Amino acid sequence: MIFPKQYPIINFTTAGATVQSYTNFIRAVRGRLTTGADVRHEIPVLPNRVGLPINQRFILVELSNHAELSVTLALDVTNAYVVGYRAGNSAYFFHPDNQEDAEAITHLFTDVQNRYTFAFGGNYDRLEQLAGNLRENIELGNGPLEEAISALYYYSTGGTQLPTLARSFIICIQMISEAARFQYIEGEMRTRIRYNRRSAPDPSVITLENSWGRLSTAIQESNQGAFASPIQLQRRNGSKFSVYDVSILIPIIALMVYRCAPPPSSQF
């Protein structure tokens, strides 16, 4: 007996990765995260957690290595968060935020021999504390991802120190979840992969990561696209960039988290 259906799996390898293979991967992850039910100002909205059936709650991302290793991350479709991962006979899950998330995570990697829930959550602030470094000091790119896949794979066996496991999650979340959320961050990772040059994310990337929920809510609560209150982001060089409307964000944000219902007047 195997419980009805099965979450979707998207594969990516860092071995010989190119801009095109990375673009294909991120497009595929977006396609499994969204349903097409909810698009506002041309920007797709992730499924609403309220009423979402457990059989539609996750996607799997199977990462492989030039080292020939594989780990599978589980993403929550409601927010694209990595909630845990499987390496061979062990799975690890971040500490759940609430009871409903704790139950949901029992539906993942159900026949793994060994199941662990970390005592810590998987938010960036907690993972930065564990890593002993901020996102701004952690290089991203294909080399970092290849290294992170091996670090997650060896964690079971004591090969990987906790600070290196936290830094590995930080790499994976930005190169998969944040790239799915933001075409701008997908483009930043494509640049690092094209030239095979790792580099830490600049303030444009960090301020978008830090503002995804505020931007989703500003767009969803806007009056015909116009924000009641501007949001300040940073350009590459750190200078302030004020966002007053959804229009400037159409090339930048690919997916929003559900924040409010769309008022009458739009997907019809």
List residues with catalytic annotation. Answer: 81, 124, 178, 181
Comparing CB distances to ligand 19L, the nearer of 67 and 222 is 222
CB atoms within 10 A of CB 114: 10
Q: Determine if residue 153 is labeled as part of a ligand binding site.
A: no
Nearer to ligand 19L, 66 or 202 (CB): 202
238 is an annotated ligand-binding site residue: no
Hunting for tokens 């896949």 — which residue is that? Answer: 149
CB of 2 to ligand 19L, least distance (A): 27
Asked whether the beta carbons of 177 and 75 are under 8 A apart, the reply is yes
The structure tokens listed for 184 are: 């701008």
Q: Which amino acid is at 49?
A: R
Annotated binding residue 81: yes
**156 close to 87: Cβ distance less than 8 angstroms:** yes
- Which residue is associated with the tokens 């564990």? 130
We find the least distance from the C-beta atom of residue 155 to ligand 19L, in angstroms, to be 15
Q: Are 140 and 199 in contact (CB under 8 A)?
A: yes
Give the residues lining the site for ligand 19L (CB under 6 A): 79-82, 94, 122-124, 173, 177, 210, 212-213, 257
- 210 among annotated binding-site residues: no
* Nearest distance from C-beta of residue 144 to ligand 19L, angstroms: 16
Toward ligand 19L, which CB reaches closer, 56 or 196?
Answer: 56
User: How many distinct helices (H) and strands (E) make up the chain?
Assistant: 9, 10
Q: From the annotation, which residues make up the binding site for a carbohydrate?
A: 9-11, 16, 51, 142-147, 196-198
